[PDB]
A = this chain, B = another copy of it.
Amino acid sequence: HTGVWVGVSGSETSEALSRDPETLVGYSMVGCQRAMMANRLSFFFDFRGPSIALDTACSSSLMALQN
């Protein structure tokens, strides 16, 4: 039941990959969406606990550690 808490405040790669609607690819979202920062870790490492990505305005890492 291990949980993953990730504090991320930037999503620039998703913005860059999805800019062009004609040639953008679907699986770009599965790899770039903020929620997938923790969900991908839980998927690979097979953790059944909470999988949350926080922003919380520049204290995201320490807030995730507190959680």
A18 to B57, CA, bound (A): 17
Stoichiometry, copies per complex = 2
**Contact string, A45-67, partner B, CB cutoff 8 A, digits 1/0?**
00000111111111010010000
Binding site for B on A (CB under 8 A): 8-9, 11, 15, 33-36, 38-39, 50-58, 60, 63
Q: Which residue of B is nearest A18, CB measured? A: B15
Which chain B positions have C-beta within 8 A of A51? 56-57
CB of B54 within 8 A of CB of A54, answer yes
Q: List 28 A–B pairs whose Cβ atoms lie within 8 Å, in order of A's numbering.
A: A8-B55, A9-B34, A9-B35, A11-B11, A15-B15, A33-B55, A33-B57, A35-B55, A35-B56, A35-B57, A35-B58, A35-B60, A36-B57, A38-B56, A39-B56, A50-B63, A51-B56, A51-B57, A52-B54, A52-B55, A52-B56, A52-B63, A53-B54, A53-B55, A53-B56, A54-B54, A54-B55, A55-B55
